Tab-separated table of C-alpha atoms and ligand atoms in Angstrom:
chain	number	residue	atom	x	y	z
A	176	UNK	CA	-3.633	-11.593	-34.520
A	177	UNK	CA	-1.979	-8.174	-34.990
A	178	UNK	CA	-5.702	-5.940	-33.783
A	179	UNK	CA	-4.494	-3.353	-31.094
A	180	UNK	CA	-7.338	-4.065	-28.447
A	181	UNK	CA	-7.766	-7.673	-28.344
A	182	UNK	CA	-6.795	-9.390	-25.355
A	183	UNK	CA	-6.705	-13.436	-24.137
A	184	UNK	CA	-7.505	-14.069	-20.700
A	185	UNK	CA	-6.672	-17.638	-19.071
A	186	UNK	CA	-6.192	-19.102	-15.688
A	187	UNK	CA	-3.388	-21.132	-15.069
A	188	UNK	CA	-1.895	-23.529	-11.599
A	189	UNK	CA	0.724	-23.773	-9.679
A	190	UNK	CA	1.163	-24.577	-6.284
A	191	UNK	CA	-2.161	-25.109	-5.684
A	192	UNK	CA	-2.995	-21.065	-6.372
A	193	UNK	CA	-4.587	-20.132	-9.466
A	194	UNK	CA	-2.557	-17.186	-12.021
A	195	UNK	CA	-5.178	-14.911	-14.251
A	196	UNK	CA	-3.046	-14.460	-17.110
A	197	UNK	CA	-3.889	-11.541	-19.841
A	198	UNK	CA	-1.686	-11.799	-22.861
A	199	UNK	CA	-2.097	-8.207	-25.453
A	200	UNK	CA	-2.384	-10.491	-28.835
A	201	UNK	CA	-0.549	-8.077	-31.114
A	202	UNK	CA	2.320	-7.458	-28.514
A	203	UNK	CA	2.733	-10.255	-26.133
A	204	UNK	CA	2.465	-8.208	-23.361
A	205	UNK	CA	1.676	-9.699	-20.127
A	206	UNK	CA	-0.657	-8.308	-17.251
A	207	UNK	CA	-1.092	-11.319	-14.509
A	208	UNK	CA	-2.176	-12.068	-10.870
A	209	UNK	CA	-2.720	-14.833	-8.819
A	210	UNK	CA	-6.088	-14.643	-7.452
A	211	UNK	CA	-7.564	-16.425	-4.177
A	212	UNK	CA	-10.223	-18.521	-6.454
A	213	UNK	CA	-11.239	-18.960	-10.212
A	214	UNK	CA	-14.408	-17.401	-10.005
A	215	UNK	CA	-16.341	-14.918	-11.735
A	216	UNK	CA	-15.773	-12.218	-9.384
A	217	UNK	CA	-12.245	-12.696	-9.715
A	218	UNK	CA	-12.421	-12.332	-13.389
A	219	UNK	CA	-14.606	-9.668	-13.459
A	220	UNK	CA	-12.809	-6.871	-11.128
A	221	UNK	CA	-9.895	-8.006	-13.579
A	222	UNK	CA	-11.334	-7.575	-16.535
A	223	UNK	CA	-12.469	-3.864	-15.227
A	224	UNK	CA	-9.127	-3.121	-13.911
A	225	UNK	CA	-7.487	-4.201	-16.994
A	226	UNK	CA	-9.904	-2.081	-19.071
A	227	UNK	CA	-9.241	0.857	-16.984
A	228	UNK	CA	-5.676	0.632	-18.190
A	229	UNK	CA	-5.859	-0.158	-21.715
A	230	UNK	CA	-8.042	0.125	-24.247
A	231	UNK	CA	-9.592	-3.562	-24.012
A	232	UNK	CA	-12.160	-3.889	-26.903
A	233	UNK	CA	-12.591	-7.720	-27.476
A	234	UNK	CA	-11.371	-10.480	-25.285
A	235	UNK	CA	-10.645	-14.283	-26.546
A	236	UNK	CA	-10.110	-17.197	-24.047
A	237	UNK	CA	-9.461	-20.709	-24.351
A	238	UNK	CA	-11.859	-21.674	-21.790
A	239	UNK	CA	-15.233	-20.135	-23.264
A	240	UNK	CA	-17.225	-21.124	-19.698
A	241	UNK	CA	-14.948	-18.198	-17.979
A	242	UNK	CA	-17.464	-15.820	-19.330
A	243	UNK	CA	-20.690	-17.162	-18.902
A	244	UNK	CA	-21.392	-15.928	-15.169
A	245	UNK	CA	-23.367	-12.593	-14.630
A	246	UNK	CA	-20.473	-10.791	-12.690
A	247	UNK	CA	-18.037	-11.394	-15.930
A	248	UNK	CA	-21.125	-9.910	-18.347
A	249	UNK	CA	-21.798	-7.152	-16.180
A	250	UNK	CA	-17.683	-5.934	-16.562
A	251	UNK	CA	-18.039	-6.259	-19.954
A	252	UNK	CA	-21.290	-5.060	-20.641
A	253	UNK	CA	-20.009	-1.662	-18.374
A	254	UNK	CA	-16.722	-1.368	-19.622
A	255	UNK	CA	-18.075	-2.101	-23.876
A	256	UNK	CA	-16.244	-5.365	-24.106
A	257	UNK	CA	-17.003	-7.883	-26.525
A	258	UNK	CA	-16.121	-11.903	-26.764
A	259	UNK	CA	-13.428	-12.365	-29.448
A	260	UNK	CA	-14.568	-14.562	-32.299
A	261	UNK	CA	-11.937	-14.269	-34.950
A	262	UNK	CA	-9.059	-15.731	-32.919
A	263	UNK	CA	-9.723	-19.602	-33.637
A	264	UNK	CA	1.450	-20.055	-25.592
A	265	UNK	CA	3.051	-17.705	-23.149
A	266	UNK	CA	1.659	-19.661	-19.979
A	267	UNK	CA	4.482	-22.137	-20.779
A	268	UNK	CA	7.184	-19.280	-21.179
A	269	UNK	CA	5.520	-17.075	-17.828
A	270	UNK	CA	6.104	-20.253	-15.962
A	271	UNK	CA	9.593	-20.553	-16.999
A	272	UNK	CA	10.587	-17.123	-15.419
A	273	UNK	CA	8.492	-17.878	-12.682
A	274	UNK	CA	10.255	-21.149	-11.623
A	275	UNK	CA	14.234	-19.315	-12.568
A	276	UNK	CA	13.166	-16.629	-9.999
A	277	UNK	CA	10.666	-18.422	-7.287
A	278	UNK	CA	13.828	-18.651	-4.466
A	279	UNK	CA	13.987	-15.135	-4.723
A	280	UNK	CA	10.754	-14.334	-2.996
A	281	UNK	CA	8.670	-15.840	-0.535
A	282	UNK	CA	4.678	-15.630	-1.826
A	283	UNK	CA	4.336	-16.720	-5.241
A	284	UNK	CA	2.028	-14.098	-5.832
A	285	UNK	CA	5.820	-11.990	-5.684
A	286	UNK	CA	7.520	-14.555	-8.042
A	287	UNK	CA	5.015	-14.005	-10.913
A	288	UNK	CA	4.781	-10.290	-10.431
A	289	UNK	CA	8.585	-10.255	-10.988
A	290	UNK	CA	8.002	-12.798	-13.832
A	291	UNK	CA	5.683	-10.241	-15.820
A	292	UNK	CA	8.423	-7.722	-15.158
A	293	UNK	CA	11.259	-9.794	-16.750
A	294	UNK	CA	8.713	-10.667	-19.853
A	295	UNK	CA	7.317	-7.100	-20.503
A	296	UNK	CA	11.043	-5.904	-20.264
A	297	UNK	CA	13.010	-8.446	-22.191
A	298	UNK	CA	14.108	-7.304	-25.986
A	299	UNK	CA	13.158	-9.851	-28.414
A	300	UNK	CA	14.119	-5.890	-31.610
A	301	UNK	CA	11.547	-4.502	-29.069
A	302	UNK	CA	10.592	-5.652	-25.614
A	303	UNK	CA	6.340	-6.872	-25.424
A	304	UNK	CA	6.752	-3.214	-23.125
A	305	UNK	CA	7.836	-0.930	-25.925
A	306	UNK	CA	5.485	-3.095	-28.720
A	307	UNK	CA	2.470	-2.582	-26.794
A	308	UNK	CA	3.028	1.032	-26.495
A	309	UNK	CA	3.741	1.087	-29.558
A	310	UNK	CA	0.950	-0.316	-31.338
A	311	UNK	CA	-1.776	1.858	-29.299
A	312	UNK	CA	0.114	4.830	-30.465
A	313	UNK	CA	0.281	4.238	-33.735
A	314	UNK	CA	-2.853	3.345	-33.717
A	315	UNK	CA	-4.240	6.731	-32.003
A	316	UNK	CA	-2.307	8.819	-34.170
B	30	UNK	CA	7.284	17.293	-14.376
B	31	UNK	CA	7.174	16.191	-17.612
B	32	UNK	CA	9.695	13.630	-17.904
B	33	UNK	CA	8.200	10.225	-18.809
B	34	UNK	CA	9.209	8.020	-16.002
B	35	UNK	CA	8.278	9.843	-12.852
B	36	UNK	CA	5.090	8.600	-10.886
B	37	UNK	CA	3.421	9.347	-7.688
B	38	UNK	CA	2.056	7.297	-4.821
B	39	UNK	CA	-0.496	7.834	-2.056
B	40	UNK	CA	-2.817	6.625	0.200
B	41	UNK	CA	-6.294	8.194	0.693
B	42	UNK	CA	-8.851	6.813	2.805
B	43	UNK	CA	-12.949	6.258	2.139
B	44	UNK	CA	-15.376	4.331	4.115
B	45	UNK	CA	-12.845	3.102	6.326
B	46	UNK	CA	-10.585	1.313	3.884
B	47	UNK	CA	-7.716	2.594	2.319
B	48	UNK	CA	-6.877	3.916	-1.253
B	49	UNK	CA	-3.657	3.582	-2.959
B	50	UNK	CA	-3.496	6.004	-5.717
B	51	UNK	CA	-0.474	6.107	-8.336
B	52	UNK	CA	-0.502	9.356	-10.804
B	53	UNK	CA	1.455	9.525	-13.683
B	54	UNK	CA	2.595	13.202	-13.428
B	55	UNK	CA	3.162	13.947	-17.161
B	56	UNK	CA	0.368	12.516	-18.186
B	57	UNK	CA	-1.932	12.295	-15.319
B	58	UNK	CA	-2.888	9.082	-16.023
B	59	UNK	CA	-4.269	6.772	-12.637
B	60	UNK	CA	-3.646	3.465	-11.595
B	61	UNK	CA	-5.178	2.361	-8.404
B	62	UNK	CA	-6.343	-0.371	-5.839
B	63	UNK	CA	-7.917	-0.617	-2.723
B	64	UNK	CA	-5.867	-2.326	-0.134
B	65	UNK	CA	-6.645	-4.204	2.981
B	66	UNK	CA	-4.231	-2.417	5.512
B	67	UNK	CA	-1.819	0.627	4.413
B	68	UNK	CA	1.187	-1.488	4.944
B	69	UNK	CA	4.740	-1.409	3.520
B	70	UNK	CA	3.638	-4.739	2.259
B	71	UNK	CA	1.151	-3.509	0.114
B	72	UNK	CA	3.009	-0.692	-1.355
B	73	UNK	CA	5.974	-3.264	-2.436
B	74	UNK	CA	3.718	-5.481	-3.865
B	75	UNK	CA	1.948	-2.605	-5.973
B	76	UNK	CA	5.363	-0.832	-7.221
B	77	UNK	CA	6.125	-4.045	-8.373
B	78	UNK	CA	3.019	-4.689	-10.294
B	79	UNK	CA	2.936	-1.147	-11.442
B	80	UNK	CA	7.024	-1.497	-12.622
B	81	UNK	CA	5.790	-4.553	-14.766
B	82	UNK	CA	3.480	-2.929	-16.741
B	83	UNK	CA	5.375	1.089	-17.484
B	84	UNK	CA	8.552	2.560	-16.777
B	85	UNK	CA	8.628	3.485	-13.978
B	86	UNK	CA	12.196	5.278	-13.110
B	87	UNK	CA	11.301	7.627	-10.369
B	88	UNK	CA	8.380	7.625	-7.555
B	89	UNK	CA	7.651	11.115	-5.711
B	90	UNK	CA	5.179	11.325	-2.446
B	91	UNK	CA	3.243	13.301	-0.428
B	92	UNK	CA	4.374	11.012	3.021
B	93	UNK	CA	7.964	10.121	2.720
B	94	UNK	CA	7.341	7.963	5.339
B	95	UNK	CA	5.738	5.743	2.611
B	96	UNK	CA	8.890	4.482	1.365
B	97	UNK	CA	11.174	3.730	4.268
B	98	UNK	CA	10.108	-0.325	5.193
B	99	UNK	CA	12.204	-2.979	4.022
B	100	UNK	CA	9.695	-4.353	1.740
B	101	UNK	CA	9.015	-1.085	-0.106
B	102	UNK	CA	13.395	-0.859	-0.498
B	103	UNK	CA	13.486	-4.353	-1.588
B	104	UNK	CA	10.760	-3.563	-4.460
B	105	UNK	CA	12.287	-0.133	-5.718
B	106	UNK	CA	15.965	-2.057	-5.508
B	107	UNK	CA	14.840	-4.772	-7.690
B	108	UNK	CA	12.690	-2.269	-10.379
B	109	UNK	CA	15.528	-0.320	-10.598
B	110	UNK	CA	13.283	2.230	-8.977
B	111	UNK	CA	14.865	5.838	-7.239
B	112	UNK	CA	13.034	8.130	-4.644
B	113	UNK	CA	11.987	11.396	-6.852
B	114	UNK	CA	13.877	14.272	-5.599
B	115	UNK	CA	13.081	16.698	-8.223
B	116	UNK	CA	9.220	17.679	-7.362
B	117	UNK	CA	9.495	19.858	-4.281
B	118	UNK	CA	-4.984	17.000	-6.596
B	119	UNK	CA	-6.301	14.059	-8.342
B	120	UNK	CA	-7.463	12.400	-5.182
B	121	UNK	CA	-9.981	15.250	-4.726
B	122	UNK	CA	-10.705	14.383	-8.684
B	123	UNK	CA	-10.999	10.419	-8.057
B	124	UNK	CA	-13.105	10.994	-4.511
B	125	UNK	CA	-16.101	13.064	-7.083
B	126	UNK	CA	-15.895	10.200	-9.738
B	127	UNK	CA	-16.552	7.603	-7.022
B	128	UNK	CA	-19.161	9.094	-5.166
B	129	UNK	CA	-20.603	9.820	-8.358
B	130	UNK	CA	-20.195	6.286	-9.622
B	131	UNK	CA	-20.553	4.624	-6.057
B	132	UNK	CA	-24.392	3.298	-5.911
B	133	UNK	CA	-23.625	1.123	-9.094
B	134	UNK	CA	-21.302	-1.415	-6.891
B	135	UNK	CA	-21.440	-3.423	-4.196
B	136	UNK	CA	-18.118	-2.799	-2.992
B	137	UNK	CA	-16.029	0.234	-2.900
B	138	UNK	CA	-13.252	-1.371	-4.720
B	139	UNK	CA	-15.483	-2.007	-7.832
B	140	UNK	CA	-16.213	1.924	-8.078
B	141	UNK	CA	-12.722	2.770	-7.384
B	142	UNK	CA	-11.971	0.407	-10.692
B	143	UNK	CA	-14.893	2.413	-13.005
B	144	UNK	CA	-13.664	5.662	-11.389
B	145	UNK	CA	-10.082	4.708	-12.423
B	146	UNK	CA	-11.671	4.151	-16.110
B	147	UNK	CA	-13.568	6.775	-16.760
B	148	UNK	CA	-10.542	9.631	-15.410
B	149	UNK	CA	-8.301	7.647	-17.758
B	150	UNK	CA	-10.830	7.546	-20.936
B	151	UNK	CA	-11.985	11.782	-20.674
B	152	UNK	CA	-11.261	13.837	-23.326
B	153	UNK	CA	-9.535	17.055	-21.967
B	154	UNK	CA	-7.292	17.363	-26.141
B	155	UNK	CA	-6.658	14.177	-25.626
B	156	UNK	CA	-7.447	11.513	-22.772
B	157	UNK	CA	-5.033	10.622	-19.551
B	158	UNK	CA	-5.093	7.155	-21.052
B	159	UNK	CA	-3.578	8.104	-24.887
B	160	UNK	CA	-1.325	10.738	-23.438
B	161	UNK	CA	0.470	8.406	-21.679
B	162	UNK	CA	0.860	5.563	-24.264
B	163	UNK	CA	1.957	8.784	-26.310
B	164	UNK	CA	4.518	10.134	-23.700
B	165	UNK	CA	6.263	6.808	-23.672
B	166	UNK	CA	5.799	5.986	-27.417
B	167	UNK	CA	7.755	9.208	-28.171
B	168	UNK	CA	10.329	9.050	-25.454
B	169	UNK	CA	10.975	5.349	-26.826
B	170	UNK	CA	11.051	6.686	-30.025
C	277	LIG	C1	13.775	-7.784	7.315
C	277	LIG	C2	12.937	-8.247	6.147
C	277	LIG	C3	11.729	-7.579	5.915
C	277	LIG	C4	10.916	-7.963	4.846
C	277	LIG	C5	11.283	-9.017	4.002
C	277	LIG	C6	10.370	-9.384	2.861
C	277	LIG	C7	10.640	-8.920	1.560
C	277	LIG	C8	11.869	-8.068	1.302
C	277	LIG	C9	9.777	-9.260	0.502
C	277	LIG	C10	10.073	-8.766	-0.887
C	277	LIG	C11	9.665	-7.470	-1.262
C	277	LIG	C12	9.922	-6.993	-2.548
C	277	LIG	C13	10.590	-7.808	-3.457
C	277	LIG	C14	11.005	-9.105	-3.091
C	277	LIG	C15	10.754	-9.590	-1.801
C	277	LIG	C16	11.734	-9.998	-4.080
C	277	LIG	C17	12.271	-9.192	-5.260
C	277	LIG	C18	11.234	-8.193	-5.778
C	277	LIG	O1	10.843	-7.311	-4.712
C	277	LIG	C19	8.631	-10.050	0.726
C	277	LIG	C20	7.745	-10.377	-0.456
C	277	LIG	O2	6.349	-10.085	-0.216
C	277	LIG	C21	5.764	-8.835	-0.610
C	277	LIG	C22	4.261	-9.080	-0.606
C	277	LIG	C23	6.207	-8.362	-2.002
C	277	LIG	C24	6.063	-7.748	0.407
C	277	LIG	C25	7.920	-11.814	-0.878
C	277	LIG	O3	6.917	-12.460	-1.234
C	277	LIG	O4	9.063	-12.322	-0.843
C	277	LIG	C26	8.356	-10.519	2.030
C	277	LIG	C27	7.136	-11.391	2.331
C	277	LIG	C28	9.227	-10.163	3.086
C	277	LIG	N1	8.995	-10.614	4.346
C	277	LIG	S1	7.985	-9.999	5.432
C	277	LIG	C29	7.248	-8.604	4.930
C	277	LIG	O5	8.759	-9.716	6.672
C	277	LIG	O6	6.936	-10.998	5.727
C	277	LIG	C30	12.495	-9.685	4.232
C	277	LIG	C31	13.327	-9.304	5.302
C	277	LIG	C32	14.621	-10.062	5.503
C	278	LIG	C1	-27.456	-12.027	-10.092
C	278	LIG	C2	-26.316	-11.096	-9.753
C	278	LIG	C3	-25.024	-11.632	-9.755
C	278	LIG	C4	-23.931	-10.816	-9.452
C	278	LIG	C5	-24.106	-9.463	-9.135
C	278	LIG	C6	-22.892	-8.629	-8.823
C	278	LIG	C7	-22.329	-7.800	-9.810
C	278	LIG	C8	-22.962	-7.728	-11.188
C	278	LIG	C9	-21.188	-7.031	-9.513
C	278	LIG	C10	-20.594	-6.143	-10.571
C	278	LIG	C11	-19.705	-6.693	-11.516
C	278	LIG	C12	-19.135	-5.887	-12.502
C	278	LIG	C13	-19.456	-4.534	-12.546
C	278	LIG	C14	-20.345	-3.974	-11.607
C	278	LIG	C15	-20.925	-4.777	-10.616
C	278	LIG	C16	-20.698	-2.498	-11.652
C	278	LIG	C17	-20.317	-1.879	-12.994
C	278	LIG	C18	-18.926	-2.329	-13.447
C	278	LIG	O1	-18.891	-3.764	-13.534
C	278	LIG	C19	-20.588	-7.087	-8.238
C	278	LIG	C20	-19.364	-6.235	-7.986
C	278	LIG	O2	-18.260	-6.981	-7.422
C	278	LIG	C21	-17.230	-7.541	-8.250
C	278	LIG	C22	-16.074	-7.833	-7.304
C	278	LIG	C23	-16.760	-6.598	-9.366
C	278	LIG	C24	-17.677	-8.857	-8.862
C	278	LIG	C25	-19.702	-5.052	-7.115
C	278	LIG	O3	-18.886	-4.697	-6.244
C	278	LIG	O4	-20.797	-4.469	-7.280
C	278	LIG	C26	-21.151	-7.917	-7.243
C	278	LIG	C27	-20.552	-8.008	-5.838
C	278	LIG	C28	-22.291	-8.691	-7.558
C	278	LIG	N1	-22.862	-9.484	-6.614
C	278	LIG	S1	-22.406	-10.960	-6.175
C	278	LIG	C29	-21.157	-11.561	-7.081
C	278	LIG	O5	-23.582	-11.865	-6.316
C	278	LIG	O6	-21.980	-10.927	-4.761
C	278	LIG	C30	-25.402	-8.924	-9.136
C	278	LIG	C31	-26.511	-9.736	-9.446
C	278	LIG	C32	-27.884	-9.100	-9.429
């Protein structure tokens, strides 16, 4: 897609922790956490945080039962977030950086903190960063 | 200040937990979290998160004392991150739009997250949250 406030929310594993992953659609910019269980709770203080951030007005998933539980409606019902249906993968390329610069820390948590740095950073010419920025600007004004 | 990369980090304290509250001093845009213990742990952890997501060249403080653990060195060394030297109150702001906000959570955290939205999305004339994206849009190009 190429809309400046949609937003695609997943959970991904590795070693044995789960990583919320939020991937900006029109940039490619990455906001992700590892986060002690996949529950709704977890999603939802996410969701809010993220929205507090930037302006989040749909979300997509590709795991529709993520938002089913009270605690996820509630974040989106406060925060005037709707479910994406007009969207019908960067988990493979976060994981990548993760695993060239796990030695380097001790929690994982640490490794894919570093990870979104080196993605949101990188110039692909624009970094995901800059494009972000870029496309709520232009889109304000 | 006005120059683009230049943030500031504190801890304030409410209900017995502890607030860690980042200001982005052109723009006075908010980011923040509550964490468990106010460790030099926690503060890495967040610069790093927060370094992922904006430029952020230079970090001022009200407690220099912050900023002199290992853990906080190791996270402004690998950001790229220097001490600000060239500055010589929103947490009275964020304390009124929590207590304000508060009886709508649960947990404190929670209204610290709606509190963090709602500064960012006022109109004061633009809001916290487009000046920002506008500050950096600008400065990029
Ligand atoms: C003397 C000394 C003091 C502190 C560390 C030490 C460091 C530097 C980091 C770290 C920080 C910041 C940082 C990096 C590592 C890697 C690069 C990015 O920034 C971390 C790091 O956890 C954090 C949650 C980010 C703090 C990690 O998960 O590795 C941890 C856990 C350490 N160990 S600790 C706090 O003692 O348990 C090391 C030595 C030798
Ligand atoms: C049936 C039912 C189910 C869930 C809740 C319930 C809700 C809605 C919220 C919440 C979420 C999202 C949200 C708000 C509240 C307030 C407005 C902003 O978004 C929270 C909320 O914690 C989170 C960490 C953000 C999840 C809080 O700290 O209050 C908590 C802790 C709840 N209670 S719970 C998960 O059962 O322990 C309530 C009812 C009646």
């Amino acid at each position: 897609d190429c809309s400046p406030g949609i937003w695609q929310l997943d959970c991904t594993h590795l070693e044995g922790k789960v990583i919320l992953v939020a991937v900006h659609v029109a940039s490619g910019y990455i906001e992700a956490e590892v986060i002690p269980a996949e529950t709704g709770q977890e999603t939802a203080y996410f969701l809010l945080k993220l929205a507090g951030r930037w302006p989040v007005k749909t979300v997509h998933t590709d795991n529709g039962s993520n938002f089913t539980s009270t605690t996820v409606k509630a974040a989106c019902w406060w925060a005037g977030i709707k479910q994406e249906f007009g969207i019908p993968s960067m988990n493979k390329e976060l994981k990548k950086i993760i695993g060239q610069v796990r030695d380097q820390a001790e929690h994982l948590k640490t490794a894919v903190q570093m990870a979104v740095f080196i993605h949101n950073k990188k110039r692909k010419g624009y970094s995901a960063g800059e494009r972000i920025v870029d496309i709520i600007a232009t889109d304000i004004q």
